[PDB]
């Protein structure tokens, strides 16, 4: 069943597992019609499928063409997510296939269970964690590849860059969530913190700046502060 902080180290053991976040699959701008009514305009989305051990992000770009002439789209999006996760699993060799898929939202349990009837040795699990994967479109390079896509397409990213050469998954995942939580709380402040020093660049094949160990600590400290500031302000506390 469900995943929480009591069984947190499970994510970093040697069972292949993926997180699936569907928050960014169906995205609309809401706008006024000439007649003064409201209409939505869908924009490209993406499925956030992440192996928390390796940092591999199977980023499936959902192109606005998939919604054309379809009804009840927020419901279709959960099922389009399930279809795409199934296909990615089926395209992977047996020894690469996940032993578990953890959905960040409970409304994905059934759509995914049903698409994986053929994989009854794969456990479909919800989580009680509040993971910030919704903020993945605040990562510039991810937003760019999604907005520019003219067709369905899938880009293998490594959302930990080369971090694993210096740190453990546990720590890399915690750093990732600390950054995503920052970006989701205050995207402006969060990103100002990441690029206030032009000397520190993002490698072409990376998502985050090439920070030294010391610089990460100072970035990680600045990100924790930001998250309290905005909380004490959300709440006046």
């Amino acid at each position: 069943g469900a995943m929480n902080s009591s069984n947190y180290a499970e994510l970093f053991n040697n069972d292949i597992k993926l997180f699936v976040d569907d928050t960014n699959v169906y995205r609309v701008t809401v706008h006024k019609t000439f007649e003064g009514n409201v209409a939505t305009k869908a924009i490209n989305g993406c499925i956030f499928t992440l192996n928390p051990k390796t940092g591999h992000l199977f980023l499936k770009i959902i192109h606005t063409s998939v919604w054309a002439g379809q009804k009840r789209l927020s419901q279709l999006a959960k099922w389009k997510t399930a279809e795409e996760v199934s296909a990615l699993v089926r395209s992977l060799p047996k020894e690469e296939q996940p032993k578990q898929i953890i959905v960040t939202r409970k409304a994905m349990l059934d759509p995914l269970e049903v698409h994986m009837l053929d994989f009854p040795n794969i456990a479909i699990r919800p989580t009680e964690l509040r993971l910030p994967f919704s903020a993945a479109m605040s990562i510039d390079k991810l937003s760019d590849v999604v907005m520019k896509a003219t067709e369905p397409q899938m880009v293998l990213f490594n959302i930990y860059d080369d971090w694993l050469d210096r740190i453990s998954s546990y720590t890399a995942f915690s750093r990732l969530t600390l950054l995503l939580r920052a970006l989701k709380t205050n995207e402006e402040s969060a990103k100002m913190i990441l690029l206030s020093d032009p000397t520190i660049t993002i490698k072409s094949y990376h998502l985050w700046p090439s920070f030294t160990d010391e610089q990460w600590i100072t970035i990680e400290s600045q990100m924790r502060d930001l998250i309290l500031t905005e909380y004490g302000r959300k709440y006046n506390v």
Partner: protein, 300 residues
């Protein structure tokens, strides 16, 4: 009209016959039930005064032989048995009638409740669900499990209900995950009706058999089967007009007949709110909706 004689009533027991029930005191001079309407299945059922745990009983059709009840003091229950010698049986039965040590199946002439609850139930089908083919009658009780329950534990004493599973490859066509799971019409119409049951009659027969096992024996597994077979029609956007009209009628009498104080355990809040209020057939069960709202408004 047919008769099921009793050798004796050695233990204090509450005896049921279809929707009727009689208290018999320990060694009361009771010798059975007469004037049983020919033409329907019947169930004679038992709850011992001492152990009100294990309700048990016997599905039979009087057209399929001469049957009587005899207490077995080894196995400690009332046993249904066939008398093969016809003249011995006429003789046994006529004595007990003349001595009037038999209760009379108490049918009100306007009353069609039993017909309405068993309309599509046939002994031939009951014997495929409860397999013990050396008897022409079928033993059921509260604790007997279903073949499905046994998957998720003695196969001889299982209820062999048709397995129904919304999240199975039987139910979901490769390539129609979403269509087949939100509109179960293929699972209902092609897999179950055309495929397994053959016609609506056999489908309704098992639904009605499952309810009655749920009601008379509080068989949890039969309750699940009844609910499951209700949910499969309610969650199918495409159902023949006649099946909906007959379902509305089936459910009406089952809801009407339920004891007022068993809604808590025999009715599944979710399945009903779904069937009556959210499902494709929310507007197809007028009779069932009316009685459920007036008699069990708490559930919805």
């Amino acid at each position: 009209m047919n008769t099921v004689p009793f050798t004796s009533a050695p233990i204090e027991v509450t005896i049921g016959i279809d929707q009727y029930s009689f208290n018999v005191k320990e060694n009361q001079p009771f010798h059975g039930i007469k004037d049983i309407p020919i033409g329907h299945v019947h169930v004679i059922h038992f709850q011992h005064a001492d152990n009100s745990s294990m309700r048990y009983g016997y599905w039979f059709d009087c057209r399929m032989g001469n049957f009587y009840i005899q207490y077995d003091p080894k196995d400690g229950l009332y046993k249904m048995m066939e008398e093969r010698d016809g003249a011995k049986f006429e003789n046994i039965v006529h004595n007990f009638k003349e001595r009037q040590m038999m209760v009379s199946y108490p049918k009100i002439d306007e009353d069609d409740t039993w017909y309405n609850l068993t309309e599509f139930v046939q002994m031939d089908k009951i014997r495929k669900i409860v397999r013990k083919d050396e008897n022409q009658f079928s033993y059921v009780d509260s604790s007997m499990t279903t073949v499905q329950e046994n998957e998720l534990s003695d196969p001889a004493h299982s209820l062999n209900y048709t397995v129904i599973n919304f999240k199975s490859r039987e139910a979901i066509r490769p390539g129609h995950e979403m269509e087949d799971f939100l509109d179960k019409s293929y699972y209902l119409n092609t897999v179950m009706l055309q495929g397994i049951f053959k016609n609506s009659s056999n489908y309704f027969g098992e639904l009605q058999f499952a309810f009655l096992n749920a009601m008379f024996f509080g068989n949890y597994g039969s309750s699940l089967q009844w609910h499951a077979m209700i949910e499969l029609i309610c969650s199918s956007a495409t159902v023949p007009k006649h099946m909906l009209d007959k379902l509305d009628e089936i459910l009406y009498y089952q809801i009407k007949t339920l004891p007022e104080q068993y809604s808590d355990i025999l009715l599944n809040e979710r399945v009903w709110n779904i069937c009556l209020y959210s499902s494709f057939q929310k507007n197809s069960l007028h009779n069932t909706e009316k009685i459920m709202e007036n008699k069990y408004p708490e559930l919805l």
